[PDB]
Amino acid sequence: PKPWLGAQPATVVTPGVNVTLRCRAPQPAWRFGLFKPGEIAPLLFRDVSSELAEFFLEEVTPAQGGIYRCCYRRPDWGPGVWSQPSDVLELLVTEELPRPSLVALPGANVSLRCAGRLRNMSFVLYREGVAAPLQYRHSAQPWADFTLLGARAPGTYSCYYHTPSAPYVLSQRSEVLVI
């Protein structure tokens, strides 16, 4: 019975905020383990006698980032014997997201793709000349396509991406794109 792992408030956060990792098993367990990759020893472990265990990371630092896994254990189990591991949880702690690239896709109407390297982000298109953004879209993919209408296409554009909700982590703006 594989447990599942969750991160609150987010999977991508700035250094200094508090992250609560939450592991849950189908039936109550005695000991929950928080593992980094390949290490037999859990970094953190909680004795709870519950189906749920919360791991509180106060003021996260870029060291607390990485791939996490949850496993549980019962008292009557062998030594170094743990349950099925949960699906991975990649926690990213950074001041800033890596800069996106803004390109035009060939096909009249014009389509742009703001591309970063991080999944689950909100992408935002800015028009050089206008303050408020032109278009914005939330995507699971590390890119988003914007469609520009025919004769409103020519101009100077740039994009940035950010986390969907607070605490926000922002990327820098892409190099401007000339149409």
Partner: peptide
């Protein structure tokens, strides 16, 4: 019935202005 959940996050702010020229 109860009040609905909160709305989604507001739209993103305006882009930052370029800085002054250098020394």
């Amino acid at each position: 019935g109860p009040p609905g959940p909160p709305g989604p996050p507001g739209p993103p702010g305006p882009a930052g202005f370029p800085g002054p020229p250098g020394p």
